[PDB]
Amino acid sequence: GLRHTFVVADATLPDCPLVYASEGFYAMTGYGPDEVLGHNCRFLQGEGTDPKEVQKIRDAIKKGEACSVRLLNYRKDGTPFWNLLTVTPIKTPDGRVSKFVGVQVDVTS
Numbered sequence: 001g002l003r004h005t006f007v008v009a010d011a012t013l014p015d016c017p018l019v020y021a022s023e024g025f026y027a028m029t030g031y032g033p034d035e036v037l038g039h040n041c042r043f044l045q046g047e048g049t050d051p052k053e054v055q056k057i058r059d060a061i062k063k064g065e066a067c068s069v070r071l072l073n074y075r076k077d078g079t080p081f082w083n084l085l086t087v088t089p090i091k092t093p094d095g096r097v098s099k100f101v102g103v104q105v106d107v108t109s
């Protein structure tokens, strides 16, 4: 299939830090687990990232609904790539959101 990555965000903490990321996420972004785990994914953003699309993610996270946006992210070396982000809320049996899982595809073509 297509080349994608995978991360898990812990919604029980107020800012949804990352608790697990697939090896492709580390290889794609240039960042390692010692600089990714425990942080919000927004470190990938930079100057050309649209504050409108970023707002669609923030609202969906606060509302506990899924979202799919096209962002401009930056590797550790500062080079830009285009990220097709899709975040999905994972809820407990009582309806509360516990984790946020996101698939990231580099659609720079």
Ligand SMILES: *[C@@]12=NC3=[C]C([C])=C([C])[C]=C3N([C][C]([O])[C]([O])[C]([O])[C]OP([O])([O])=O)C1=NC(=O)[N]C2=O
Pocket: 007, 008, 009, 016, 040, 041, 042, 044, 045, 054, 055, 057, 058, 061, 071, 072, 073, 083, 085, 087, 100, 101, 102, 104
């Ligand atoms: C990021 N991937 C990513 C993966 C998951 C599972 C979640 C929940 C979020 C992301 N983001 C967005 C980021 O964490 C944050 O939610 C946004 O910056 C919007 O919130 P604020 O209020 O801080 O602006 C991802 N953002 C990226 O740029 N790249 C991803 O791969």
